[PDB]
Amino acid sequence: RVEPPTALYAEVDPRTRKVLYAIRAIYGADGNEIVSATLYLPDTTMTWLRAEGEWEAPTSTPHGLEMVPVIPISNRTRLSDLYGTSEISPELRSVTD
Amino acid sequence: GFSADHSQIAQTKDTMFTGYLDPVQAKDYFAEAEKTSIVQRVAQKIPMG
Amino acid sequence: SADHSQIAQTKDTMFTGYLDPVQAKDYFAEAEKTSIVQRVAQKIPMGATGIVIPHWTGDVSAQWIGEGDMKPITKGNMTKRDVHPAKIATIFVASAETVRANPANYLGTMRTKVATAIAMAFDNAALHGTNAPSAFQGYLDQSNKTQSISPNAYQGLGVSGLTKLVTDGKKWTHTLLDDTVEPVLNGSVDANGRPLFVESTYESLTTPFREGRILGRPTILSDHVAEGDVVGYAGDFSQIIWGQVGGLSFDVTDQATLNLGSQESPNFVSLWQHNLVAVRVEAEYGLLINDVNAFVKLTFDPVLTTYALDLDGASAGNFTLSLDGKTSANIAYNASTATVKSAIVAIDDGVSADDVTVTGSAGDYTITVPGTLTADFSGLTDGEGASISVVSVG
Numbered sequence: 001r002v003e004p005p006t007a008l009y010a011e012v013d014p015r016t017r018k019v020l021y022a023i024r025a026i027y028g029a030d031g032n033e034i035v036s037a038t039l040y041l042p043d044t045t046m047t048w049l050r051a052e053g054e055w056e057a058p059t060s061t062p063h064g065l066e067m068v069p070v071i072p073i074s075n076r077t078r079l080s081d082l083y084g085t086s087e088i089s090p091e092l093r094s095v096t097d
Numbered sequence: 098g099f100s101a102d103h104s105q106i107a108q109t110k111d112t113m114f115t116g117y118l119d120p121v122q123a124k125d126y127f128a129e130a131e132k133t134s135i136v137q138r139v140a141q142k143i144p145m146g
Numbered sequence: 147s148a149d150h151s152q153i154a155q156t157k158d159t160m161f162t163g164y165l166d167p168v169q170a171k172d173y174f175a176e177a178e179k180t181s182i183v184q185r186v187a188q189k190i191p192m193g194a195t196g197i198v199i200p201h202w203t204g205d206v207s208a209q210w211i212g213e214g215d216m217k218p219i220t221k222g223n224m225t226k227r228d229v230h231p232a233k234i235a236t237i238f239v240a241s242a243e244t245v246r247a248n249p250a251n252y253l254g255t256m257r258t259k260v261a262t263a264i265a266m267a268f269d270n271a272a273l274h275g276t277n278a279p280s281a282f283q284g285y286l287d288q289s290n291k292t293q294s295i296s297p298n299a300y301q302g303l304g305v306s307g308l309t310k311l312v313t314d315g316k317k318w319t320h321t322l323l324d325d326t327v328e329p330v331l332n333g334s335v336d337a338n339g340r341p342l343f344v345e346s347t348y349e350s351l352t353t354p355f356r357e358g359r360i361l362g363r364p365t366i367l368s369d370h371v372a373e374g375d376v377v378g379y380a381g382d383f384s385q386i387i388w389g390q391v392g393g394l395s396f397d398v399t400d401q402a403t404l405n406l407g408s409q410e411s412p413n414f415v416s417l418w419q420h421n422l423v424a425v426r427v428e429a430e431y432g433l434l435i436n437d438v439n440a441f442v443k444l445t446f447d448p449v450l451t452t453y454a455l456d457l458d459g460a461s462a463g464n465f466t467l468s469l470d471g472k473t474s475a476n477i478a479y480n481a482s483t484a485t486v487k488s489a490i491v492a493i494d495d496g497v498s499a500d501d502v503t504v505t506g507s508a509g510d511y512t513i514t515v516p517g518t519l520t521a522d523f524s525g526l527t528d529g530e531g532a533s534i535s536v537v538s539v540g
Contacts (some may be wrong), residue, residue, distance in 0.1 A: 030144035053142040054133075105219050116198060116226050 002073070010040075010070050014082070022070040040068045147241065147420040153406060154422060155240040157247075164249035178262045181269040182368045183388065183433075186320060192389025192432050196230035199434075231391050231432040232279035234264055239404065239417070239424040257425075261394055264429050266370070272388075272433055274373055275538070284435035286379055290518050290536050291442040292451055295327070295377070299334040300342055304361045307380060307442050310518065313471065316440040320383040321354075321365055323444070324372035328355060330446065374538060375449050381441030391430035398425050450501070450514045454537045455521060457509040460529030469493050470517045479526060480508040490515065512537070 003024060010022035021041050028035040037055075038047040046060040063069060074084030101110045109118055149156045163169060190197070204223030211217060238256055245253065271278035274287045291310045295302035303321065311318050331352045334342045343352035350356075354365040363380075371378055400423045407413035417424050457465070457479055464476040467490065477489050487504040490513070491497055503514040513519065523532035 028144065032144035032146060033142060053137050053140070104221060107221055113224055116200065 008070070010068075010072060012072075012083070019068050019070050019072065021068055040070050042066065042068050045069065147422070153239070155244045155252075157241070157243060161244075161247075161249040161252075164247065169250075178258065179266055179370050180262075181265040182322065182366065182371065183269050183272045183386070184265070186322060186366055186383050187386035187388050188384070190387045190389040190432075192231060192391055194231065194391055194430075196228055196432065197389075198226055198228045201225050201227070227434075229283065229387075229389075229432045229434050230281045231389065231430045232281040233428065233430045234267055234279075235426070235428045236260055236264075237404065237424055237426055239422050242400065242421045242423055245423045253425075257396065260427055264394065264427065268429075268431055268433075269370075270373075272386075272435075273371060273379075282433045284433075284438045286381075286435065286438070286441055287376065287443070287538055288438045288536050289379075289381070289441040289443055290439060290451065290453075290520075292449060293380075293442050293444055294446065294448040295444050296330050296446045298342075299331050302444075303380060307444070308361075310442055311381065311440070314439060316437070317382045317384075318363055318380060321360065321363055321378065321380040321444075322371060322383075323354065323365060323367055323378040325367065325369050326372050327377050327444075328352075331355060375445050376443050377446060378444040379441055380444060382437075385436040385440050387432075387434050387436070389432045391432075394427070394429045396425060396427060398423065400424070448516070450516055451519070452537050452539070453513045453515070453519050453534055455506075455511040455513060455534045456532065457523070457526065458529030458531035458533070459509060460523075460526045460532055463527035464525045465521055465523050465532070466525065467493075468520045468522070469497070469515065470495060476525060479528070482508070483511065486511060486513070 007026065008022060008024045011020040012018070013020050021039065023040075024038040025034050026036045027033065034050055036047065036049050038045065042065065044060060044062045046058045048058045049056040072084075075081075075087055077085050099106055099108065101108070102112060107113075147156060148154065150158055202222070202224050204221065206222050207218075207220050209218045238260065240252075248254075267277070270276045271282060272285055275285050278285060293302055293307035293310065295307075308318055331343050331354060332341060336342060341348070341352070343354060344350065354360050355367065357365055357367060359365065400417050400421065402418075402424065403414055403416050404424065405412050405414050415422075460479050462479060464478055466476045467474040469490070472493055472495050474489050474493055477486065481489070483504045483506055487499070487502060490502050490504070491499050495517075497515070497517075501516050505512050519534070521534045523530075526532055
């Protein structure tokens with residue numbers, strides 16, 4: 001499944017371009033409280049519920065991969081564009097306004 | 098016993114060995130568990146900006 | 147922001163004509179001064195904690211014994227010293243317009259110039275006391291031995307000078323010479339007026355100035371060893387250790403704030419609010435000369451040596467002096483400057499009251515003498531920091 005950057009975030013090792021670890025944060029229907037969170041590590045993935053104002057004990061699952069099961073799609077203007085720039089370019093923003 | 102510097106005998110208490118015979122550091126076996134808020138348990142959290 | 151600033155840079159007068167096609171390189175550029183101490187001395191693995199050097203000290207012993215005469219008991223002994231790295235630093239700062247233009251590659255120039263200055267600040271804190279940090283142990287100017295080289299360098303180094311090392315049981319392993327020394331090597335001649343250190347047609351440089359050996363010891367040159375009376379050194383350069391905690395480090399920003407005055411007289415400026423850009427520089431060094439006595443200072447002509455002598459406020463017992471290894475009488479803990487002067491001039495080697503000078507007060511003396519002066523405090527009975535050392539002044 002694909003997830004947007006408004007719900008999943010991932011750290012990158014700038015030495016190797018490998019994803020280090022990543023978090024999925026489900027805001028509730030209110031769009032302001034995180035009602036569950038999931039952490040992807042290289043060895044395993046684990047998840048907390050956040051009903052009743054504080055984290056429940058995490059459920060967990062291993063996956064045995066050498067690497068975290070998250071892959072970044074990115075827009076990439078250049079080789080220098082290490083994290084990928086928005087396609088709504090600053091000149092197009094300027095002529096829209 | 099003998100003086101902590103005795104001329105005839107080499108002892109672990111002698112000032113001569115003070116660089117080597119240190120006590121080893123260990124886990125704090127008495128470490129207190131962290132507190133937590135009680136209000137955030139009993140009060141319903143309301144989503145807010 | 148100000149303009150023509152005494153600390154910052156703002157398209158200052160330095161950069162007049164920076165864009166002009168008629169500007170060439172500095173055809174008269176002078177090569178960068180390296181440290182020499184970091185080239186002659188043993189580099190040691192070092193870290194932010196500092197390091198401990200252990201050393202043995204015990205006079206372990208055995209005795210001859212007859213059959214059945216029951217054997218003696220003995221014990222060894224050993225000791226600890228430690229060295230902590232000191233830290234050296236600077237900042238330089240420029241307008242973003244200067245950083246954009248980079249006139250005459252000023253930024254690149256400035257990085258390499260401050261790198262030489264940090265190396266020379268270490269070097270000049272080791273060969274001499276100059277602004278030295280508290281955590282360094284010793285500097286070579288303390289060494290209490292001198293030698294004139296000028297009339298004939300061979301008699302100077304290999305005979306007269308080398309005597310002063312071996313008499314104290316110190317080795318001679320290297321010699322270090324300033325560029326200004328060269329005329330004395332060229333002028334070192336036999337009685338027929340032919341030079342010693344060069345082959346018969348006098349085509350080539352004298353062998354020490356090829357970095358060749360003198361009497362089996364290697365010779366090291368430098369552009370910048372000489373200061374005050376002193377043109378170079380000889381000694382056991384195996385007695386020096388030094389070390390460094392990571393690379394010469396540059397960090398850069400425009401976000402931060404600088405004080406342009408002292409901590410007690412602050413004059414803060416935001417880098418951001420004026421659009422200035424600043425560079426931080428740091429390095430972190432340790433040094434230890436294991437025995438300051440194991441060197442000889444080299445001078446052109448002969449010179450007097452000056453000593454500071456302090457008795458740690460001891461109010462009882464008698465100390466004694468020794469000059470070039472010949473002992474004085476014993477001297478009281480509160481003797482006058484005149485009483486110390488006459489007790490020095492009484493030494494049987496031929497010292498005299500026109501050469502010897504003494505100044506100060508009871509328990510706190512400066513002495514000037516034409517030799518290696520030393521003192522024994524073991525006959526004092528009321529203090530233990532009692533000490534003597536060489537001192538040098540402008």
